[PDB]
Amino acid sequence: VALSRTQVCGILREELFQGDAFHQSDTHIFIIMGASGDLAKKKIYPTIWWLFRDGLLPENTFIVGYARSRLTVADIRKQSEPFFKATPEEKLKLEDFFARNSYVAGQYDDAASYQRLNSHMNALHLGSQANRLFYLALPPTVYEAVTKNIHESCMSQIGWNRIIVEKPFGRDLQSSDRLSNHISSLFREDQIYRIDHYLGKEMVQNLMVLRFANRIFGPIWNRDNIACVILTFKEPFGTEGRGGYFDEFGIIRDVMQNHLLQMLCLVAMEKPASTNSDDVRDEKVKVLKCISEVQANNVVLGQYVGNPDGEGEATKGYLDDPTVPRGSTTATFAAVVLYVENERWDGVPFILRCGKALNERKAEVRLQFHDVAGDIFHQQCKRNELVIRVQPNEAVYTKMMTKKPGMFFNPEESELDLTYGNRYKNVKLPDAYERLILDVFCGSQMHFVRSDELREAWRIFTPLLHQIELEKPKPIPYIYGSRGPTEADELMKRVGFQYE
Amino acid sequence: VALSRTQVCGILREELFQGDAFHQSDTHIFIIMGASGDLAKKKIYPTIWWLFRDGLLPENTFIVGYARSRLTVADIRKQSEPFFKATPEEKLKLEDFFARNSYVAGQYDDAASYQRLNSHMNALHLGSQANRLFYLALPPTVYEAVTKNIHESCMSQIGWNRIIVEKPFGRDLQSSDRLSNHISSLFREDQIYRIDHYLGKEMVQNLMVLRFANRIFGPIWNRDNIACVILTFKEPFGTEGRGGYFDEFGIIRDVMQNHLLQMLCLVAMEKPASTNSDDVRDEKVKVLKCISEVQANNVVLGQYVGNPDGEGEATKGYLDDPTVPRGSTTATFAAVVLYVENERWDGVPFILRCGKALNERKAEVRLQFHDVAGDIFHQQCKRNELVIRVQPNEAVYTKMMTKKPGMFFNPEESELDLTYGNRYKNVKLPDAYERLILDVFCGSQMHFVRSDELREAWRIFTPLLHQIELEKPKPIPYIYGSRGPTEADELMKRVGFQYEG
């Protein structure tokens, strides 16, 4: 039997209600700092709406917008409601949602503006007691000011205070440390939520059960059995005339140093002492501490060019973006190989491969197993694989050999679906991002990057990023819609990976 | 895409043709010694018919019946054809089949009778050159005479000569050795086919690919990961007024010392040097040599009694069989635990559990894996299993833990079908026994018990069988249609097995 999207929300609501960590009865205030900006308009307001609509917020929740512009809730609603995908059935819930919304104009480094915000909050029903959740939907160039002022003027004295922080988390170890040390002098680790929009909560929890609940998979999750691991993140669209911001960061900073490294950690970790957030993040950090600074011989960069035979956007290269400097050498593609130098993984290449303007949307973890030690089937045996796909359609499946009916033993490659076993025919999930914000309401930090974790991430990548900035290597061109530079394929072959 | 019975036979015929082992061009003679008897009538003639019909015999194959009774092919046909399950589509093939049939009346210890059989064979088209395949469908009490006479009078000088031999393969080490030494002084090991009717050729070959072609299963196929192995053989019917012959053997000799021990060997074997029959049988023998003589404390015997609440035969106990001695102590049920004392298996109980008048038909291999080393999911994790069912309906599947959708990590037990992977939806195969006779045409001895293998099988069980015969322990009663004596459950719990509740 299948589970609808609405039945999954019933199960979740019931779990939130039974559990101590989500306080359904207490008052909550959700503060969107930067409520006028595009992130708020297109992602945050719609998503807090989805939570509200799904019955997954505490019943007493208020949304307070705060930005420089002098706006009404009516304005917020006009700019944001198109991205809510609201239906006619939801007209009542949408009224009730907007009734819980308010806006406060202010400057980001003006103490008086923050006192108005605090008074505004205090003036809500039970505002002085509410749990306060601050979403910092702002460039990190104002984070020092905003976190300073929030701490001085805006903290609940009764409820908890939690802040959600957006990438970039610096651009290297030293800038990351300046920002992280600043925020840490004001907020405890258990108040800081560094979010990863791309972390697929359902698939990472599937993976943990698959590995840690089962003798079939746990004993082969090591270098004696695994030839390589591939972490793939692919977008088919380029920068869409908006690449100016990206151009200052590049693909490694954008998605690899943060998101792909988290996935590596979840694949490579030792079994945690428990499923508590900090036991799990302890094991994520132990992994990073076993990884050496990556060197350039393990890296292939590319930059997309237009396709002469394309139509629409496909005909334009990265440099044809009007907001991108002519002769920028910033990479829109990287393939990178890391090693986890410990008992479980030494020698196993972890291959991170991502880019824009590629052939498909795909986000995926692939374990490719070694060949059998001694093939009694005339070399017909392909390497087994375990694939966890997140980004197009979620799936867990194992590629393996099976007998073809007939005389003697002719194995053929086959696939089995391990997504929810035999149990559930269809499963329609809540948005992963919706679930991630819900985590912050529940006090669950497992899938958010910890300070120690972040430092290790920057140590790994920083020598290389500095070297790229100083040596300015020309990245390899690749046609829009292709799989990227063929040199990425060569790096993968060279370190142990097999295609056909 | 699903595969019909006819499509599977197309694939097999093509394989027989491309392979050097089959010889689609040679003439073959299939001799059913004991053609008048029940086994021929109900199993052998039907099965050689199914081979013929399926297009799996060499084009020039003759079937020669031989027994004492003075019969025609018309007689054979009348008694056997009901068990052929022939349809209207097959009317022409059935004519063609019976045209290839002949019968010779003869005594089993009469050299003149065997010369007539040899002359009869020589007189067939290319008879003097044909491969000759002798099915000894006779009690083993005449095997010495029959194999002596066949060797003296009936061997091709040009084609190969192969004999199929039926259990019982003796009743202990000494009797087995007398019979086997006799047959071996006349026939090479490559001519002797000791058959096991119950060996499911398709599932055994599936299993070999599953284990040996994959990193998923091969590395955990050992004592570090497997808590116990269960080999189950269950019939829901009792002896049906025919238990007189069984009564002289008991359930261990009947199905365990032969069939279940072969299944153990296929589960426990090391990876062979190749898939050649004798590399594989070498590994089956290495296993047996690592097994000690089984002791009585590891054995539970039972004997069925009638069910007061039943209907039909279910109301009658084993002793209510008119052909069974009053107060026979013969076991209709056994549960036995063996150990393979080697690097791969030491400590792992191999539990052989079989009998008659039980709750269902089942033939099955079950690997129960150890619990996870430290459970971070609050002890909700059940042991993984790999199950290969042969009857009632073939299946390979794995019990494992999966995440329930929702907030935390609530694993639930689930089953995955591994049989043909995703590839083949529905599959109708030829009978395993059909495939086993075909193996003899192909020269493939993999699934037939070898002389050295047989000796090891008897060494393992002979002290116990002698002890049972001499101390005559009373077997434990169990109601017809139950799962057998609950003491069998206790032996299984005692050695490390976990029930599902």
Numbering used by the authors:
A (entry chain E): 5 to 504
B (entry chain A): 5 to 505
What do the authors say?
To elucidate the molecular mechanism of G6PD inactivation by KAT9- and CBP-dependent K403 acetylation, we determined the crystal structure of AcK403 G6PD. The protein crystallized in the P1 space group, with eight monomers within the asymmetric unit, and the structure was determined at 2.28 Å resolution. That said, the structure of AcK403 included an α helix at the N-terminus (residues R9–Q22, hereafter referred to as αa’) that has not been observed in other crystal structures of human G6PD. Lysine 403-acetylated G6PD was crystallized without structural or catalytic NADP+, and a close examination of the structure revealed acetylation-dependent conformational changes at the dimer interface and the substrate binding site. In non-acetylated G6PD, positively charged K403 and R370 interact with the phosphate groups of NADP+. Following K403 acetylation, the acetylated residue adopts a different conformation that is stabilized by electrostatic interaction with R370, excluding the structural NADP+ from its binding site. This minor conformational change in the structural NADP+ binding site was accompanied by distortion of the β-sheet at the dimer interface (mainly βN) and unwinding of the short αl helix. First, the newly formed loop (formerly αl) reshaped the dimer interface, in line with the observed differences in the dimeric structure. Third, in AcK403 G6PD, K205 was rotated by ~180° relative to its position in WT G6PD, and held in position by electrostatic interaction with D443. This conformational change was accompanied by the unwinding of helix αf’, the disposition of helix αf away from the substrate binding site, and the reorientation of functionally important residues such as Y202, and H201, that together rendered the enzyme inactive. In summary, K403 acetylation-dependent conformational changes in the NADP+ binding site reshaped the dimer interface and propagated to the substrate binding site via partial unwinding of helices αl and αf’, disposition of helix αf, and deformation of the G6P binding site.
Glucose-6-phosphate dehydrogenase (G6PD) catalyzes the first and rate-limiting reaction in the PPP; the oxidation of glucose-6-phosphate (G6P) to 6-phosphogluconolactone with concomitant reduction of nicotinamide adenine dinucleotide phosphate (NADP+) to NADPH. G6PD is a major source of cellular NADPH and has a primary role in controlling the metabolic flux through the PPP. G6PD is catalytically active as a homodimer or homotetramer. Each monomer has one G6P binding site (i.e., the catalytic site) and can bind two NADP+ molecules; one is close to the G6P binding site, and the other is the structural NADP+ binding site.
